[PDB]
Every structure is written in structure tokens, then in C-alpha cells.
Design a protein around this ligand. Structure first.
Ligand SMILES: [Cl-]
Ligand SMILES: [Cl-]
Length: 164
């Protein structure tokens, strides 16, 4: 299992513009197009991202291309962030994926705000971090996903993604 497989499970794959859990226009593997309610705006964003007139639909290869760019951006966001980098460097490879998963979903800024959980992760207090992470809007709005991620941080194994 790796970060790509993990996010593919959490985000799924859709080749036509759809709305994410928050009601935002998205496509491919969780690639947010815009927070604007305008489908037209979303369509334009899509064409700009892909480099052709898509009319709202893309190929699997295109979805995969966007996906690689998105994972790259998440990782780079972590590496550039002063609060994130030290935690990320302190974690084993599996747990690191859980952190990348969060950034992909909520953005660098969003995750950097989880101050207390970040400190607990850096201290390797797994059970305590898990409880703290669960006291969030994040956990309450997307509980199944949050549970998989939190379990990953808690155990350092891929168990939560096994049998999916
Ligand atoms: Cl809460
Ligand atoms: Cl969920």
C-alpha cells in the first residue's frame, strides 16, 4: 500500500464533474475545481487544468495526471510549512501517509491549525493524538474517512485500508 492507493480509496474516481461532500465542484480523484456555485466556472477551471475543451469530462489518464500533481502539491506543502515539516520528518513512512492524506483533503493551512494533535504526533503519543484528532469538525463531517486516517496514525499499519 502507498499514498496513491490510499487516497484512491478515500476519494474514489469520477470522470465527470461532481460535487464533493461539501458541495464543491470536483473531478477525477478528489481534484477540487472551484468553491464557486457556478458550473460554468467549474468547466472553465477544468479546461484550464487539462489544457483542452473537456465539456465537463476527462479520461482516466487525465484524472491520473491531475492526481499526481495534486499529491505532489500536498507533499511540497508539507515540506515548506514550518509547523508541518518537523512533524512529517519525525514520522515513520506509514504514519507520514496519514499526514499527507489530511493535507490533500483539507490543505496545508487547514492541517497546520491542528496544533495540539501535531504536537502529540511529534511526541509519539499515538492514543492521545487519536482522541484529539477526533474532536474536530473533520471527524464529524467525514467520520469513516477520518476513522481510517486516525487509525493509521494510531497503529502505523495499513490495517484500516485492508479489505476495501
Ligand atoms: Cl468536537
Ligand atoms: Cl467519510
Amino acid at each position: 500500500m502507498n499514498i496513491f492507493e490510499m487516497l484512491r480509496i478515500d476519494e474514489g474516481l469520477r470522470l465527470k464533474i461532481y460535487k464533493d461532500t461539501e458541495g464543491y465542484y470536483t473531478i477525477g480523484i478528489g481534484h477540487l475545481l472551484t468553491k464557486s456555485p457556478s458550473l460554468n466556472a467549474a468547466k472553465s477551471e477544468l479546461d484550464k487544468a487539462i489544457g483542452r475543451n473537456c465539456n465537463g469530462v476527462i479520461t482516466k489518464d487525465e484524472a491520473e495526471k491531475l492526481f499526481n500533481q495534486d499529491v505532489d502539491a500536498a507533499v511540497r506543502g508539507i515540506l515548506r510549512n514550518a509547523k508541518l515539516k518537523p512533524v512529517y520528518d519525525s514520522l515513520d513512512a506509514v504514519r507520514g501517509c496519514a499526514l499527507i492524506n489530511m493535507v490533500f483533503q483539507m490543505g496545508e493551512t487547514g492541517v497546520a491549525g491542528f496544533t495540539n494533535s501535531l504536537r502529540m504526533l511529534q511526541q509519539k503519543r499515538w492514543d492521545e493524538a487519536a482522541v484529539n484528532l477526533a474532536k474536530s469538525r473533520w471527524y464529524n463531517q467525514t467520520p469513516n474517512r477520518a476513522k481510517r486516517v486516525i487509525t493509521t496514525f494510531r497503529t502505523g499499519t495499513w490495517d484500516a485500508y485492508k479489505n476495501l
